[PDB]
Coordinates of all heavy atoms in Angstrom, one line a residue:
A1 N -32.2 6.3 -13.9 CA -32.5 5.1 -13.2 C -31.2 4.2 -13.2 O -31.1 3.4 -12.2 CB -33.6 4.4 -13.9
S2 N -30.4 4.3 -14.2 CA -29.2 3.5 -14.3 C -28.0 4.3 -14.0 O -27.0 3.8 -13.6 CB -29.1 2.8 -15.6 OG -28.9 3.6 -16.7
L3 N -28.1 5.6 -14.4 CA -26.9 6.5 -14.2 C -26.5 6.6 -12.8 O -25.3 6.6 -12.5 CB -27.3 7.9 -14.6 CG -26.2 8.9 -14.5 CD1 -25.0 8.5 -15.4 CD2 -26.7 10.3 -14.7
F4 N -27.5 6.7 -11.8 CA -27.1 6.8 -10.4 C -26.4 5.6 -10.0 O -25.5 5.6 -9.1 CB -28.4 7.0 -9.6 CG -29.0 8.3 -9.7 CD1 -30.4 8.5 -9.5 CD2 -28.3 9.4 -10.0 CE1 -30.9 9.7 -9.6 CE2 -28.8 10.6 -10.1 CZ -30.2 10.8 -9.9
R5 N -26.8 4.4 -10.5 CA -26.2 3.2 -10.2 C -24.8 3.1 -10.7 O -23.9 2.6 -10.1 CB -27.0 2.1 -10.7 CG -28.4 2.0 -9.9 CD -29.1 0.7 -10.3 NE -29.5 0.7 -11.7 CZ -28.9 -0.1 -12.6 NH1 -28.0 -0.9 -12.2 NH2 -29.3 0.0 -13.8
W6 N -24.6 3.7 -11.9 CA -23.2 3.8 -12.5 C -22.3 4.5 -11.6 O -21.2 4.1 -11.4 CB -23.2 4.5 -13.9 CG -21.8 4.5 -14.4 CD1 -21.3 3.6 -15.2 CD2 -20.8 5.5 -14.1 NE1 -20.0 3.9 -15.5 CE2 -19.7 5.1 -14.8 CE3 -20.7 6.6 -13.3 CZ2 -18.5 5.7 -14.7 CZ3 -19.5 7.3 -13.3 CH2 -18.4 6.9 -13.9
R7 N -22.8 5.7 -11.0 CA -22.0 6.5 -10.1 C -21.6 5.7 -8.9 O -20.5 5.8 -8.5 CB -22.8 7.7 -9.7 CG -23.0 8.8 -10.7 CD -23.9 9.9 -10.2 NE -24.0 11.0 -11.1 CZ -24.9 12.0 -10.9 NH1 -25.7 12.0 -9.9 NH2 -25.0 13.0 -11.8
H8 N -22.6 5.0 -8.4 CA -22.3 4.1 -7.2 C -21.1 3.2 -7.5 O -20.2 3.1 -6.7 CB -23.5 3.3 -6.8 CG -23.2 2.4 -5.7 ND1 -23.1 2.9 -4.4 CD2 -23.1 1.1 -5.7 CE1 -22.8 1.9 -3.6 NE2 -22.8 0.8 -4.3
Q9 N -21.2 2.5 -8.6 CA -20.2 1.6 -9.0 C -18.9 2.2 -9.2 O -17.9 1.7 -8.7 CB -20.6 0.9 -10.3 CG -19.6 -0.1 -10.8 CD -19.6 -1.3 -9.9 OE1 -20.6 -1.6 -9.3 NE2 -18.5 -2.0 -9.9
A10 N -18.8 3.4 -9.8 CA -17.6 4.1 -10.0 C -16.9 4.5 -8.7 O -15.7 4.4 -8.6 CB -17.8 5.3 -10.9
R11 N -17.8 4.9 -7.8 CA -17.3 5.3 -6.5 C -16.6 4.2 -5.8 O -15.5 4.3 -5.2 CB -18.4 5.9 -5.6 CG -17.9 6.4 -4.3 CD -19.0 7.1 -3.6 NE -20.0 6.1 -3.1 CZ -19.9 5.4 -1.9 NH1 -18.8 5.6 -1.2 NH2 -20.8 4.6 -1.5
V12 N -17.3 3.0 -5.8 CA -16.8 1.8 -5.2 C -15.5 1.4 -5.8 O -14.6 1.1 -5.1 CB -17.8 0.7 -5.4 CG1 -17.1 -0.6 -4.9 CG2 -19.0 1.0 -4.6
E13 N -15.4 1.4 -7.1 CA -14.2 1.1 -7.8 C -13.0 2.0 -7.4 O -11.9 1.5 -7.2 CB -14.4 1.0 -9.3 CG -15.3 -0.1 -9.7 CD -15.6 -0.1 -11.2 OE1 -15.1 0.7 -11.9 OE2 -16.4 -0.9 -11.6
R14 N -13.3 3.3 -7.3 CA -12.3 4.3 -6.9 C -11.8 4.0 -5.5 O -10.6 4.1 -5.3 CB -12.9 5.7 -7.0 CG -13.0 6.2 -8.4 CD -13.6 7.6 -8.4 NE -15.0 7.6 -8.3 CZ -15.8 8.6 -7.8 NH1 -15.2 9.6 -7.3 NH2 -17.1 8.4 -7.8
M15 N -12.7 3.6 -4.6 CA -12.3 3.3 -3.3 C -11.5 2.1 -3.2 O -10.5 2.0 -2.5 CB -13.5 3.1 -2.4 CG -14.3 4.4 -2.1 SD -15.6 4.1 -0.8 CE -16.7 3.1 -1.7
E16 N -11.8 1.1 -4.0 CA -11.1 -0.2 -4.1 C -9.7 0.1 -4.6 O -8.7 -0.4 -3.9 CB -11.8 -1.1 -5.1 CG -11.1 -2.4 -5.2 CD -11.8 -3.4 -6.2 OE1 -12.8 -3.1 -6.6 OE2 -11.2 -4.4 -6.5
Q17 N -9.6 0.8 -5.7 CA -8.3 1.0 -6.3 C -7.4 1.9 -5.4 O -6.2 1.6 -5.2 CB -8.4 1.7 -7.6 CG -7.1 2.0 -8.3 CD -6.5 0.7 -8.7 OE1 -7.1 -0.2 -9.3 NE2 -5.2 0.5 -8.4
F18 N -8.0 2.9 -4.7 CA -7.3 3.7 -3.8 C -6.7 2.9 -2.6 O -5.6 3.1 -2.3 CB -8.3 4.8 -3.2 CG -7.6 5.7 -2.2 CD1 -6.8 6.7 -2.6 CD2 -7.9 5.5 -0.9 CE1 -6.2 7.5 -1.7 CE2 -7.3 6.3 0.1 CZ -6.4 7.3 -0.3
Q19 N -7.6 2.1 -2.1 CA -7.2 1.2 -0.9 C -6.1 0.3 -1.3 O -5.1 0.2 -0.6 CB -8.4 0.5 -0.4 CG -8.1 -0.3 0.8 CD -7.8 0.6 2.0 OE1 -8.2 1.7 2.1 NE2 -6.9 0.0 2.9
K20 N -6.2 -0.3 -2.5 CA -5.1 -1.2 -3.0 C -3.8 -0.5 -3.1 O -2.8 -1.0 -2.7 CB -5.5 -1.8 -4.3 CG -6.6 -2.9 -4.2 CD -6.9 -3.4 -5.6 CE -7.9 -4.5 -5.6 NZ -8.4 -5.0 -6.9
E21 N -3.9 0.7 -3.7 CA -2.7 1.5 -3.8 C -2.0 1.8 -2.5 O -0.8 1.6 -2.3 CB -3.0 2.8 -4.5 CG -1.8 3.7 -4.8 CD -2.2 5.0 -5.5 OE1 -3.3 5.1 -6.0 OE2 -1.4 5.9 -5.5
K22 N -2.8 2.2 -1.5 CA -2.3 2.6 -0.2 C -1.7 1.4 0.4 O -0.6 1.5 1.0 CB -3.4 3.1 0.7 CG -3.0 3.5 2.0 CD -4.1 4.1 2.8 CE -3.7 4.5 4.3 NZ -4.7 5.2 5.1
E23 N -2.3 0.2 0.3 CA -1.8 -1.0 0.9 C -0.5 -1.5 0.3 O 0.4 -1.9 1.0 CB -2.9 -2.1 0.9 CG -4.1 -1.9 1.8 CD -5.1 -2.9 1.6 OE1 -4.9 -3.8 0.9 OE2 -6.1 -2.8 2.3
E24 N -0.4 -1.3 -1.0 CA 0.8 -1.7 -1.7 C 1.9 -0.8 -1.4 O 3.1 -1.3 -1.2 CB 0.5 -1.8 -3.2 CG -0.4 -2.9 -3.6 CD 0.1 -4.3 -3.2 OE1 1.3 -4.5 -3.3 OE2 -0.6 -5.1 -2.7
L25 N 1.6 0.5 -1.2 CA 2.7 1.5 -0.9 C 3.2 1.2 0.5 O 4.3 1.4 0.8 CB 2.1 2.9 -1.1 CG 1.8 3.3 -2.5 CD1 1.1 4.6 -2.5 CD2 3.1 3.4 -3.2
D26 N 2.2 0.9 1.4 CA 2.6 0.6 2.8 C 3.4 -0.6 2.9 O 4.4 -0.7 3.7 CB 1.3 0.5 3.7 CG 1.6 0.4 5.2 OD1 2.1 1.4 5.7 OD2 1.3 -0.6 5.8
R27 N 3.0 -1.6 2.2 CA 3.7 -2.9 2.1 C 5.1 -2.7 1.7 O 6.1 -3.1 2.4 CB 3.0 -3.9 1.2 CG 3.8 -5.2 1.1 CD 3.1 -6.1 0.1 NE 3.1 -5.5 -1.3 CZ 4.1 -5.5 -2.1 NH1 5.3 -6.0 -1.8 NH2 4.0 -5.0 -3.3
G28 N 5.3 -2.0 0.6 CA 6.6 -1.7 0.1 C 7.5 -0.9 1.1 O 8.7 -1.2 1.2
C29 N 6.9 0.1 1.7 CA 7.6 0.9 2.7 C 8.1 0.0 3.9 O 9.2 0.1 4.2 CB 6.7 1.9 3.3 SG 7.5 3.0 4.5
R30 N 7.2 -0.9 4.4 CA 7.6 -1.8 5.5 C 8.6 -2.8 5.1 O 9.5 -3.1 5.9 CB 6.3 -2.5 6.0 CG 5.3 -1.6 6.7 CD 4.1 -2.4 7.1 NE 3.1 -1.5 7.7 CZ 3.1 -1.1 9.0 NH1 4.0 -1.5 9.8 NH2 2.1 -0.3 9.4
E31 N 8.6 -3.3 3.8 CA 9.6 -4.2 3.4 C 10.9 -3.6 3.3 O 11.9 -4.1 3.8 CB 9.2 -4.7 2.0 CG 8.0 -5.7 2.0 CD 7.6 -6.1 0.6 OE1 8.1 -5.6 -0.3 OE2 6.6 -6.8 0.5
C32 N 11.0 -2.4 2.7 CA 12.3 -1.7 2.7 C 12.8 -1.2 4.0 O 13.9 -1.3 4.3 CB 12.2 -0.4 1.8 SG 12.0 -0.8 0.0
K33 N 11.8 -0.9 4.9 CA 12.1 -0.6 6.3 C 12.8 -1.7 7.0 O 13.7 -1.5 7.7 CB 10.8 -0.2 7.0 CG 11.0 0.2 8.5 CD 9.7 0.6 9.1 CE 9.8 0.9 10.6 NZ 8.6 1.3 11.2
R34 N 12.2 -2.9 6.8 CA 12.8 -4.1 7.5 C 14.1 -4.4 6.8 O 15.0 -4.8 7.5 CB 11.9 -5.3 7.4 CG 12.4 -6.5 8.0 CD 12.6 -6.3 9.5 NE 13.2 -7.4 10.2 CZ 12.5 -8.4 10.7 NH1 11.2 -8.5 10.6 NH2 13.2 -9.4 11.3
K35 N 14.2 -4.3 5.5 CA 15.4 -4.6 4.8 C 16.6 -3.7 5.3 O 17.7 -4.2 5.6 CB 15.3 -4.5 3.3 CG 14.4 -5.6 2.7 CD 14.3 -5.3 1.2 CE 13.4 -6.4 0.5 NZ 13.2 -6.2 -0.9
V36 N 16.3 -2.4 5.4 CA 17.4 -1.5 5.9 C 17.6 -1.7 7.4 O 18.8 -1.6 7.8 CB 17.0 -0.1 5.6 CG1 15.9 0.5 6.5 CG2 18.3 0.8 5.8
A37 N 16.6 -2.1 8.1 CA 16.8 -2.4 9.5 C 17.7 -3.6 9.8 O 18.6 -3.5 10.6 CB 15.4 -2.7 10.2
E38 N 17.6 -4.6 8.9 CA 18.4 -5.8 9.0 C 19.8 -5.4 8.5 O 20.8 -5.9 9.0 CB 17.9 -6.9 8.2 CG 16.6 -7.5 8.7 CD 16.8 -8.1 10.1 OE1 17.9 -8.6 10.4 OE2 15.9 -8.1 10.9
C39 N 19.9 -4.5 7.5 CA 21.2 -4.1 7.0 C 21.9 -3.3 8.1 O 23.1 -3.4 8.2 CB 21.0 -3.3 5.7 SG 20.5 -4.3 4.3
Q40 N 21.2 -2.5 8.8 CA 21.7 -1.6 9.9 C 22.3 -2.5 11.0 O 23.4 -2.3 11.5 CB 20.7 -0.7 10.4 CG 20.4 0.5 9.5 CD 19.2 1.3 10.0 OE1 18.4 0.8 10.8 NE2 19.0 2.5 9.5
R41 N 21.6 -3.6 11.3 CA 22.1 -4.6 12.2 C 23.4 -5.2 11.7 O 24.4 -5.2 12.4 CB 21.1 -5.7 12.4 CG 21.7 -6.9 13.3 CD 20.7 -8.0 13.3 NE 20.3 -8.4 12.0 CZ 21.0 -9.2 11.1 NH1 22.2 -9.5 11.4 NH2 20.5 -9.5 10.0
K42 N 23.4 -5.5 10.4 CA 24.6 -6.1 9.8 C 25.7 -5.0 9.7 O 26.9 -5.4 9.7 CB 24.2 -6.6 8.4 CG 25.4 -7.3 7.7 CD 24.9 -8.0 6.4 CE 26.0 -8.7 5.7 NZ 25.5 -9.4 4.5
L43 N 25.3 -3.7 9.5 CA 26.4 -2.7 9.5 C 27.1 -2.6 10.8 O 28.4 -2.5 10.8 CB 25.7 -1.3 9.3 CG 25.1 -1.0 7.9 CD1 24.4 0.4 7.9 CD2 26.1 -1.0 6.8
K44 N 26.4 -2.8 11.9 CA 27.1 -2.9 13.2 C 28.0 -4.1 13.3 O 29.1 -4.0 13.7 CB 26.1 -2.9 14.3 CG 25.3 -1.6 14.5 CD 24.3 -1.7 15.6 CE 23.5 -0.4 15.7 NZ 22.5 -0.4 16.8
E45 N 27.5 -5.2 12.7 CA 28.3 -6.5 12.7 C 29.6 -6.3 11.9 O 30.6 -6.8 12.2 CB 27.4 -7.6 12.2 CG 26.3 -8.0 13.2 CD 25.3 -8.9 12.6 OE1 25.5 -9.3 11.5 OE2 24.4 -9.3 13.3
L46 N 29.4 -5.7 10.7 CA 30.5 -5.5 9.8 C 31.6 -4.5 10.3 O 32.8 -4.7 10.1 CB 30.0 -5.0 8.4 CG 29.2 -6.0 7.6 CD1 28.6 -5.3 6.4 CD2 30.2 -7.1 7.2
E47 N 31.1 -3.5 11.1 CA 32.0 -2.6 11.7 C 32.9 -3.3 12.7 O 34.1 -3.1 12.8 CB 31.2 -1.5 12.4 CG 32.0 -0.5 13.1 CD 31.2 0.6 13.8 OE1 30.0 0.6 13.7 OE2 31.8 1.5 14.4
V48 N 32.2 -4.2 13.5 CA 32.9 -5.0 14.5 C 33.9 -6.0 13.9 O 35.0 -6.3 14.4 CB 31.9 -5.8 15.4 CG1 32.6 -6.8 16.2 CG2 31.1 -4.8 16.3

């Protein structure tokens, strides 16, 4: 009666944590993407 509900909770928590992980990894990727993109712009400027 309570076990099933425990399972539910655990599943939810797993989905939550998974989603957070994904979002944080995506965030980091995009940040470094933008940072290197701006650096690449600057690389062209430094070359000139």
Side-chain angles (χ1 to χ4, degrees):
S2 65
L3 182 64
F4 287 155
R5 293 187 295 108
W6 181 91
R7 288 176 174 170
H8 177 73
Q9 183 66 27
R11 186 175 70 82
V12 171
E13 291 178 1
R14 282 178 281 154
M15 290 189 291
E16 179 181 352
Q17 184 63 51
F18 177 78
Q19 185 64 32
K20 287 178 176 176
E21 181 179 346
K22 182 176 179 179
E23 290 177 2
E24 290 301 319
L25 291 172
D26 188 66
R27 179 183 61 78
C29 184
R30 290 178 186 276
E31 289 174 0
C32 290
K33 181 178 178 180
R34 182 62 185 272
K35 288 177 182 179
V36 72
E38 291 299 329
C39 290
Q40 288 171 341
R41 174 185 53 75
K42 186 172 180 177
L43 290 174
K44 290 179 180 180
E45 292 171 359
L46 290 172
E47 182 178 359
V48 171

